[PDB]
Amino acid sequence: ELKVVTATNFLGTLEQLAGQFAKQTGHAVVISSGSSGPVYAQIVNGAPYNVFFSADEKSPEKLDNQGFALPGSRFTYAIGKLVLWSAKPGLVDNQGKVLAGNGWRHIAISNPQIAPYGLAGTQVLTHLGLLDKLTAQERIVEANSVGQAHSQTASGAADLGFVALAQIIQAAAKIPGSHWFPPANYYEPIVQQAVITKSTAEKANAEQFMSWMKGPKAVAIIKAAGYVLPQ
C-alpha cells in the first residue's frame, strides 16, 4: 500500500502510471496531490507519504539536504513543457502575440512561490516584458496549483492560462482550444525530481516503484503525456 504524493501537474500521468504498475505487479498505490511547495512543507511536517513527485528539483534537493529524503533516491523522472492555453479556439496564436494585447480578460497563473509551473509562466511574462503591465492591470489571477490554473482555464473562468502539456494533450496527441508553447529560452526548464521519504515503512516497495518509473513502460507513458526525459 504505497502512499504517493505528487505535484498537481503530474496527477493524471501518475494515475496512468499507477494503473499500469498495478496491472503488472498487483500493487495498488494511493495517490495524493498538491502544489510542490505545500507538499514539501507537509513532508517536513511529517506527512506519512512514501514517495514524492515534485514539479522541480529544489524541493527534493532540500528534503535530501535536510535528511527527510532517503539518501540516493533522488532522480529526474520527467521534464515538463509549459503551455499557454485557452479553451477558445483561435484566441492563442502560435507565436504568443496574444499576451501583449487586450483581446482577453484574465490569465490563470499558478502561484510562483509554490507551484513551479507558475514560476515558469511568470518567467515567460518577464521574458516578454509583460509581467509588470499585466500585474498592474490586475489581469493575472493567482491559482494555488497548476491543477487549479488548468481547471480555471478549462472551464473558461480564465480566458488564458499557463498549464502543463500533460493536462491538455489528448490520447491521439491533439490539444483542444488554442495553445502556444513558449520557446525553451523563455523560462528555465521544468526539471521534475522525485524522492523516497526516508521514514517510509515500505522501503522495498518504494524502491521497486522508483525503479519501475525509470523502465520502458513508465517512460513511454511519461512521454505520451508530453514530458521529456534526461538525455
Describe the structure.
- The chain is of the alpha/beta class.
- It has 2 domains: 1-80 and 190-231, D-Maltodextrin-Binding Protein, domain 2 (3-Layer(aba) Sandwich), CATH 3.40.190.10; 81-189, Periplasmic binding protein-like II (D-Maltodextrin-Binding Protein, domain 2, 3-Layer(aba) Sandwich).
- Helix content is 34%, strand content 20%.
- The chain has 8 helices and 10 strands.
- Strands 2-1-3-10-4 form a 5-stranded mixed beta sheet, with helices on both faces. A 5-stranded mixed beta sheet has the order 7-6-8-5-9, sandwiched between helices.
- The longest helix has 15 residues, at 11-25.
- The radius of gyration is 18 Å and the shape is globular.
- The relative contact order is 0.23.
- The PDB classes it as binding protein.
- Keywords: molybdate, tungstate, binding protein, periplasm, ABC transporter.
Name some characteristics of this structure.
231 residues, alpha/beta, D-Maltodextrin-Binding Protein, domain 2, 2 domains, five-stranded mixed beta sheet, 8 helices, 34% helix, 20% strand, globular, metal-binding, metal ion binding
Described by the principal axes of the CA atoms, the overall outline is globular
How many beta-strand segments? 10
CATH topology of the largest domain: D-Maltodextrin-Binding Protein, domain 2
Secondary-structure element order, as H and E? EHEHEHEEEHHEHEEEHH
Strand pairing plus helix content: what structural class?
Answer: alpha/beta
Q: Main sheet, how many strands, which sense, barrel?
A: 5 strands, mixed
Provide the domain count. 2
Q: Just name the CATH architecture of the largest domain.
A: 3-Layer(aba) Sandwich
Strand content: 15-25%
CATH superfamily of the largest domain: Periplasmic binding protein-like II
Number of helices: 8
How widely separated are the two ends? Answer: 32 Å
So what's the CATH class of the largest domain?
Answer: Alpha Beta
Strand order of the largest sheet: 2-1-3-10-4
Helix content: 25-40%
| Rg on CA atoms, Å | 18 Å
